[PDB]
Amino acid sequence: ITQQQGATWGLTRISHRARGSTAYAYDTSAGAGACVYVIDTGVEDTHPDFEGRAKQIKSYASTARDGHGHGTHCAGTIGSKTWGVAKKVSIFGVKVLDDSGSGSLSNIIAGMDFVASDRQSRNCPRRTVASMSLGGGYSAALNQAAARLQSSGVFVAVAAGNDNRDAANTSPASEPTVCTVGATDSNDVRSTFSNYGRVVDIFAPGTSITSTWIGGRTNTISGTSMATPHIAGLAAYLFGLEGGSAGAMCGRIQTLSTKNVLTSIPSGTVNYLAFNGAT
């Protein structure tokens, strides 16, 4: 167990039962041997903070690289050296959204099955994760694709949505079999924009999260898209430390989670906050 001093709040929060720490405590295994696919606007794999552990390998949009930054930020929270949860994990960028931030249903689905097939040919001994920080209106097609990816042996973490309503009307968030992620702020209050409801499985840091950005810079933004990679990284971390299965990982994260500390969690929604068991 090592301690990253002065780490960004999201990392400090998932490594401690209570607010107050300025450090990120985590096991040195740091997710080594695990793989995390980021289905978003792409990942600027040239960012120095990835130490070459990130690779943008597929695009279904107009361009082939992340010209927005959203996907790079999520990738950064997953495993960048300075802002990441699993600092030694391998990251793969799958671009399904154009640089504006939008993409077709067909391309989003195609991004999911691509992960399902590609991960089979990659050396990912500890296991594979799919991080989906995207969420539009309800879509059976999106839910089915996410379900297929999950069933194929990949742990899928998806954003709950930012409509401040039940995530039942958001996809892939509404898919029962995936791990749906809500967002919280540094004072343990549900993010003002975070969706909720029975379909949400876990909450993680999502308000004012700092991470990698395009141009080799950094940025601080908010959204369930920021909370999702905390969970994606946590699973990669657990895979590399205690192992586990893709099908039991969401439940494992719920079991380990810090309970009853969040404010504004309506009855019927789980008051579970991501915890890595490092302290």
Swiss-Prot record:
GO molecular function: serine-type endopeptidase activity
Record keywords: Disulfide bond, Hydrolase, Protease, Secreted, Serine protease, Signal, Zymogen
Top enzyme category: hydrolase
UniProt subcellular location: Secreted
Residues of the Peptidase S8 domain: 8-279
Disulphide bond pairs: 35-124, 179-250
Protein known as: Alkaline serine protease ver112
Organism name: Corniculantispora psalliotae (Lecanicillium psalliotae)
Boundaries of the shown chain within the full protein: 104 to 382 of 382
